[PDB]
Amino acid sequence: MKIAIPKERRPGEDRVAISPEVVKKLVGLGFEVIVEQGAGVGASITDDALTAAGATIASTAAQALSQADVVWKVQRPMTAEEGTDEVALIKEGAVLMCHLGALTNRPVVEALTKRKITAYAMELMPRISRANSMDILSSQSNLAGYRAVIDGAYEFARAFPMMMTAAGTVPPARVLVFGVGVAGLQAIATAKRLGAVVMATDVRAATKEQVESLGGKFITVAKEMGEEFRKKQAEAVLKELVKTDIAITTALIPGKPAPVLITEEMVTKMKPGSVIIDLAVEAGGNCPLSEPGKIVVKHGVKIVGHTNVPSRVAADASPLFAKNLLNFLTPHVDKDTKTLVMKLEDETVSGTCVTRDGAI
Amino acid sequence: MKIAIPKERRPGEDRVAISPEVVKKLVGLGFEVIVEQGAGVGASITDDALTAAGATIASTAAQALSQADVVWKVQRPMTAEEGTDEVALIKEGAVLMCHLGALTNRPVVEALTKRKITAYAMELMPRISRANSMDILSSQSNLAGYRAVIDGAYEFARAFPMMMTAAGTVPPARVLVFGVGVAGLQAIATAKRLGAVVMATDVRAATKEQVESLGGKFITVEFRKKQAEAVLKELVKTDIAITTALIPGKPAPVLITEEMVTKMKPGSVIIDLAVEAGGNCPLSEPGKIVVKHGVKIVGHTNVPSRVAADASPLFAKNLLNFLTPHVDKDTKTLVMKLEDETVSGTCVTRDGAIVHPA
Amino acid sequence: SVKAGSAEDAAFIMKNASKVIIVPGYGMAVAQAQHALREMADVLKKEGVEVSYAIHPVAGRMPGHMNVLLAEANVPYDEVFELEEINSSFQTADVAFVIGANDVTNPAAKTDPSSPIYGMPILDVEKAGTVLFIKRSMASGYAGVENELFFRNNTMMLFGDAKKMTEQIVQAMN
Numbered sequence A: 001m002k003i004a005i006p007k008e009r010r011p012g013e014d015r016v017a018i019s020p021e022v023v024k025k026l027v028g029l030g031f032e033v034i035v036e037q038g039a040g041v042g043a044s045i046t047d048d049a050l051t052a053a054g055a056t057i058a059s060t061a062a063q064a065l066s067q068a069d070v071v072w073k074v075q076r077p078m079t080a081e082e083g084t085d086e087v088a089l090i091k092e093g094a095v096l097m098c099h100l101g102a103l104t105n106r107p108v109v110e111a112l113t114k115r116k117i118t119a120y121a122m123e124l125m126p127r128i129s130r131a132n133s134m135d136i137l138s139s140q141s142n143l144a145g146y147r148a149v150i151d152g153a154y155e156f157a158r159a160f161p162m163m164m165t166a167a168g169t170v171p172p173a174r175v176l177v178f179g180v181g182v183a184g185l186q187a188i189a190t191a192k193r194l195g196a197v198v199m200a201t202d203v204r205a206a207t208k209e210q211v212e213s214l215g216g217k218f219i220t221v222a223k224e225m226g227e228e229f230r231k232k233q234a235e236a237v238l239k240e241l242v243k244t245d246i247a248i249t250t251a252l253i254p255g256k257p258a259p260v261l262i263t264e265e266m267v268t269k270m271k272p273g274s275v276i277i278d279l280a281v282e283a284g285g286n287c288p289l290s291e292p293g294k295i296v297v298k299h300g301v302k303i304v305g306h307t308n309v310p311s312r313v314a315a316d317a318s319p320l321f322a323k324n325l326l327n328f329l330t331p332h333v334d335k336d337t338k339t340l341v342m343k344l345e346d347e348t349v350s351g352t353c354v355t356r357d358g359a360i
Numbered sequence B: 001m002k003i004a005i006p007k008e009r010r011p012g013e014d015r016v017a018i019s020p021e022v023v024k025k026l027v028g029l030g031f032e033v034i035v036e037q038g039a040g041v042g043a044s045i046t047d048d049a050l051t052a053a054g055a056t057i058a059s060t061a062a063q064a065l066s067q068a069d070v071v072w073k074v075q076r077p078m079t080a081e082e083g084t085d086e087v088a089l090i091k092e093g094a095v096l097m098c099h100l101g102a103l104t105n106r107p108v109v110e111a112l113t114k115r116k117i118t119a120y121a122m123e124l125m126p127r128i129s130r131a132n133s134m135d136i137l138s139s140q141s142n143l144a145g146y147r148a149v150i151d152g153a154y155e156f157a158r159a160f161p162m163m164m165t166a167a168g169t170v171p172p173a174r175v176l177v178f179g180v181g182v183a184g185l186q187a188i189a190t191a192k193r194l195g196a197v198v199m200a201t202d203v204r205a206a207t208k209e210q211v212e213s214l215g216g217k218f219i220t221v222e223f224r225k226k227q228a229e230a231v232l233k234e235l236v237k238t239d240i241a242i243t244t245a246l247i248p249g250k251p252a253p254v255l256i257t258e259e260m261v262t263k264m265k266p267g268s269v270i271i272d273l274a275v276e277a278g279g280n281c282p283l284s285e286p287g288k289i290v291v292k293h294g295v296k297i298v299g300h301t302n303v304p305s306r307v308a309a310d311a312s313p314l315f316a317k318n319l320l321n322f323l324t325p326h327v328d329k330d331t332k333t334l335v336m337k338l339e340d341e342t343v344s345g346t347c348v349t350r351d352g353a354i355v356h357p358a
Numbered sequence C: 001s002v003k004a005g006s007a008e009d010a011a012f013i014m015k016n017a018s019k020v021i022i023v024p025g026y027g028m029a030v031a032q033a034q035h036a037l038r039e040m041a042d043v044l045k046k047e048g049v050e051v052s053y054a055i056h057p058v059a060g061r062m063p064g065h066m067n068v069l070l071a072e073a074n075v076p077y078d079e080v081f082e083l084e085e086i087n088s089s090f091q092t093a094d095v096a097f098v099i100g101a102n103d104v105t106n107p108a109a110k111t112d113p114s115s116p117i118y119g120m121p122i123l124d125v126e127k128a129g130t131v132l133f134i135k136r137s138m139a140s141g142y143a144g145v146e147n148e149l150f151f152r153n154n155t156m157m158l159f160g161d162a163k164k165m166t167e168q169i170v171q172a173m174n
Ligand SMILES: NC(=O)c1ccc[n+]([C@@H]2O[C@H](COP(=O)([O-])OP(=O)(O)OC[C@H]3O[C@@H](n4cnc5c(N)ncnc54)[C@H](OP(=O)(O)O)[C@@H]3O)[C@@H](O)[C@H]2O)c1
Pocket: B129, B138, C024, C025, C026, C027, C028, C030, C031, C057, C058, C059, C060, C061, C062, C063, C065, C100, C101, C102, C103, C104, C105, C134, C135, C136, C137, C138, C139, C140, C141, C142, C143, C160, C161, C162, C163
């Protein structure tokens, strides 16, 4: 059995579905491991370091994938309709594991279905204790939380910590975190490390205890809530939003668009030089002024909406994505046979499998 | 008297030499305080917030400065020889307080002299205890140290802190700070609180204590220059290298040769805070991020201005602290005492003639 | 000239006090004693005592030196006060617990007009009921000058490492 990992071709993608550590466990698992030349460049993973773990290097994308019984990609493969046709390079009847984005990308599902390829969309991992080590939304969003604060502090023209000085006191930044999920908790941690005062809020009551244990103070006021709650929330939020220096929005709802938490009129009330980091921008934004891939400036407030934020920490994000994949795949290699058999009753397998052998 | 604060016209200067808290004090000492419109926009200080503290908003720079007895700015005023004559806007016989860079900018000294202006180079403040509140070298450098770490982390493709997660563990960033003045100590502290392992090196021996007082490890150990091998041993393991070493009037020391950067790991960044004086790294280029041998070498100019919203209040305070002991009763006038070491060590020209020894 | 006390002496003084304002300096940073210090304060205020921190603008060897270290030690921001807003509280403080500071308290900044530290604003620790100074020896601070506050009626020298001495004081508090 061969497993292959290409370079990521989509604009801005510096992540890679591989690391030296993972190559080693895969060689010991029974695979030969091929990796495209320079596929690890953006994650600071070199070819020589992949070789010493025991993989081979292929000169091109086509050569990596051509005899591969299983392919590992970070993002979904492009189609002819997008430019280069990657689906076409994957061998007939191979298996494909990646962030396929399958529910909102039907042309990629039908392109693979035609080449007999079996695809497992990591992002549809069922949310259960034992699948936490396989979860890619979690590993990647956690890193996005850290980066949200690093991107805030860079765009911000004041410093984060309090400092009593001979020339006066630089007060501490005040940070406010809509949504306290994986990325929510990491932005609070990191903002606290830099010496800010950190407010947070959520529709989930269990999250209050988590905020208080990290050193944040919770704002008393996941499914669609309604318009009546959004008003109680905006009013309760307003006192703190008005003294807030950075504001990180992270809120998502399965299926539906991202909840508006900071409207136009609210930003109108924030201090000049304030910053909003919208991690939910690729889903419509928690702030409607945000636009994917750019920094809007409006009312003296900088609304930042980078895309694929995990790829802005690609050297940490890569080795953790590749372990998500190794954890998903390891339970289904039987002891000494060089074959892949996914149990099917295993809900890890069923909830993530989109197409297999010709049919959906 | 009247005191006026223009907008900084030099490219990339977002600072201003005022704040609302300082305007309130200047009125309290008897000044009518004018500031030019749009001057505080870089520092998130609106004209609304200035007017409320007791300040009048002039419409152009010249109008602001025309009847001003005292003038405050952050960077030295431009001459006609650089295309904009700002010294010409300053009133004959007036007082200018700013970061003049007087020991290295003789043309601006002389252009002020012709107009018979008294200029007080703030950078030439004497290193005594009571001058700490007047000292712009430390207040502005301190912020640059902070911001160095923030720019390094922005450029770095990994997280500073160690992270133990369900999917696995990613190790912390390692940071090496060359030079341990004010800027490098704040760099050490900001890298430290973000979770990085932090190393430092400095040719002064009594620096070791300083570095450990912030939780960093000092790089320890005829020709004692096998110390270079101790530096090279860490630098080879380093993610972010921040170099802060300057020498007033001279070019910066080279601390990371092109030779050392070739032995550095890929994805590494060097933040050269000495870039305006030629860099601690000769590969650094003012105002840009050059890449070579896999390493991003970052060399932003005017780093205090990349934190202009806190940098400016502190600067403005330094100016007020320098000026306040010299205001007295007599129908609102400032009277600068020669006896005061803080005045004689800082003054550079007085009514038509250059006065500073250098 | 100079009365010297021990961990156990300083424990009795602060345990039998209503108000204590801690005053950290470089010495605290060198010894890295923040964590022991903050533990002392929260066993101090568990006893009903009122506890503040007084930060001199130029404590340590950088701006914000005390601030970063108290922040890593999880000191609440609401307990930390700048010189100008806490200098009048010393009058009503039973103890000024000075740990690793020296120059920051020396009243030769007010008095001796030939002094290197002259003109500097200082923390008024002498106004407290009694001052506990922690340092290893009788050496000066940065400024190279002696502190008169050392050898006077209501002052107490605690001779050791700031981390060790604080740890030892937390022990004797039970
Ligand atoms: N913060 C800044 O930006 C900055 C910058 C430059 C200069 N300065 C100057 O530095 C001074 C700071 O004043 P400060 O009162 O904080 O400190 P200081 O005046 O220098 O005194 C610190 C004291 O801590 C003691 N110490 C050193 N190591 C210790 C240890 N491990 N355990 C316990 N004690 C220890 C020392 O005496 P022992 O050795 O006997 O224990 C010393 O007397 C000011 O004069 C300021 O002007 C400040």
